[PDB]
């Protein structure tokens, strides 16, 4: 005998350049064997998401596995999770096809804007030793510029803080500088730079009645940055 994929399932980052797909030969190794593979489309398109590939996996006498590089294509357009597969045909004569003989590889986008939130909800700190950066994390993922307001609230102890953080591309983290009592500090809602080419196209899609949005457009709409659970932090001062 038998010949079958293993791993029979690979998960892969759109930016992984490529990755190995491994195949196994059980049963009578002793003699050369072989088998073919062909990438074939799922939701992930050969052409846009990966490259098509038929091939011949040769198994000289004494080898019960072959790997083989598949290329995952990278781009800057937000897409949901996508799929594509790889099938074993044409085994050599000695041998039967097993389970699985269809490998599944999924492409994870990384063109989201994306989702913004604090790390924890409470941070204990020190009567007066100055400053001390309050982190803000950007979750999966880190495409486009995203601007995002910040202001503080009272609960004399600190100086009030306001602004708009600017996460440029692949900016995943940024910091608010401040500057037993507590106060809260909020984050508003993320928006793109008003004038980043994307913010427009989306504005365009954002008028086509939803019933009109091309599938492409519907997925362009949820490319937009969002907020997470905790959009507020308390600061305890002791
Ligand atoms: Ca695609
Ligand atoms: Ca993709
Ligand atoms: Ca993409
Ligand atoms: Ca990408």
Dihedral over Cα of 227, 229, 232, 235: its sign: negative
14 is in an annotated binding site: yes
Name residues with Cβ closer than 5 Å to ligand 2, which is an ion.
49, 79, 82, 107
CATH class, 114-238 region? mainly beta
User: Contact at 8 Å (CB) between 166 and 121?
Assistant: no
77 is in an annotated binding site: yes
111 is in an annotated binding site: yes
Cα–ligand 2 centroid distance for 218 (angstroms): 16
Q: Is 1-113 CATH 2.60.40.2030?
A: yes
Q: Tokens 């500088």 map to which residue?
A: 177
User: Contact at 8 Å (CB) between 155 and 126?
Assistant: no
Cα–ligand 1 centroid distance for 10 (angstroms): 18
Report residue 115 as tokens.
């989702």
Could you tell me the end-to-end alpha-carbon distance of the chain, in angstroms, rounded to an integer? 72
Cα–ligand 1 centroid distance for 48 (angstroms): 5
Q: Which residues contact 115 (CB under 8 A, 6 or more apart)?
A: 138, 139, 140, 225, 226, 227, 228
The Cα–Cα gap between 31 and 18 comes to 31
Cis peptide before 100 (omega within 30 of 0): yes
157 is in an annotated binding site: no
The Cα–Cα gap between 229 and 215 comes to 28
Cα–ligand 1 centroid distance for 165 (angstroms): 31
For residue 7, which of 107, 83, 102 has the smallest C-alpha distance? 102
Judged by its nearest atom, the ligand closest to the C-alpha of residue 48 is 1
- Tell me the HSE value of 151 on the side-chain side, using a 13 A CA sphere: 5
49 is in an annotated binding site: yes
Resolution in A: 2.3
Cα–ligand 3 centroid distance for 73 (angstroms): 8
Q: In a 10 Å sphere around its CB, with 0-12 CB exposed, 13-18 middle and 19+ buried, how is residue 117 labelled?
A: middle
The Cα–Cα gap between 217 and 211 comes to 11
The Cα–Cα gap between 123 and 182 comes to 10
64 is in an annotated binding site: no
Output phi, psi for 204, to 5 deg. -65, -45
Q: In a 10 Å sphere around its CB, with 0-12 CB exposed, 13-18 middle and 19+ buried, how is residue 151 labelled?
A: middle
Question: Residue 90: left if φ>0, alpha if ψ -120 to 50, beta else—which one?
Answer: left
76 is in an annotated binding site: no
User: Contact at 8 Å (CB) between 109 and 53?
Assistant: no
In 3-state terms, what secondary structure has residue 61?
A: coil
Question: In 10 A of CB 204, how many CB atoms?
Answer: 10
User: Contact at 8 Å (CB) between 86 and 8?
Assistant: no
Helix (H) or strand (E) segment spanning residue 203: helix 197-205
In the chain, residues under CATH classification 2.60.40.2030 are 1-113, 114-238
Question: In 10 A of CB 23, how many CB atoms?
Answer: 23
CA-to-CA dists, residue 130 to 24, 28, 157, 173, 228, angstroms: 61, 73, 11, 22, 29
Q: Which residues contact 29 (CB under 8 A, 6 or more apart)?
A: 59, 61, 62, 63, 64
The DSSP call for residue 32 is -
Cα–ligand 1 centroid distance for 12 (angstroms): 14
79 is in an annotated binding site: yes
Report residue 7 as tokens.
């791993």
């Amino acid at each position: 005998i038998r010949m079958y994929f293993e791993p029979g399932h690979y998960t892969v980052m759109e930016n992984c350049g490529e990755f190995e797909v491994r195949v196994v030969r059980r049963g009578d190794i002793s003699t050369y064997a072989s088998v073919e593979y062909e990438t074939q489309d799922g939701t992930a398109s050969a052409g846009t998401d990966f490259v098509g590939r038929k091939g011949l996996l040769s198994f000289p006498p004494g080898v019960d596995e072959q790997r083989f590089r598949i290329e995952v294509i990278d781009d800057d357009v937000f897409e949901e999770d996508e799929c594509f597969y790889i099938r074993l045909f044409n085994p050599s004569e000695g041998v039967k096809l097993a389970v699985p003989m269809i490998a599944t590889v999924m492409i994870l986008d990384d063109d989201h804007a994306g989702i913004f939130a604090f790390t924890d909800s409470v941070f204990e700190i020190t009567e007066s030793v100055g400053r001390f950066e309050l982190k803000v994390m950007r979750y999966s993922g880190a495409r486009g510029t995203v601007i995002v307001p910040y202001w503080t609230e009272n609960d004399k102890d600190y100086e009030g803080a306001r602004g708009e953080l600017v996460f440029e591309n692949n900016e995943s983290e940024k910091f608010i500088d401040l500057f037993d009592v507590s106060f809260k500090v909020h984050i508003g809602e993320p928006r793109l730079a008003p004038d980043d080419e994307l913010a427009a196209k989306i504005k365009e899609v954002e008028k086509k009645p939803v019933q009109d949005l091309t599938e492409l457009d519907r997925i362009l709409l949820l490319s937009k940055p969002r907020n997470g659970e905790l959009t507020t932090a308390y600061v305890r001062i002791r």
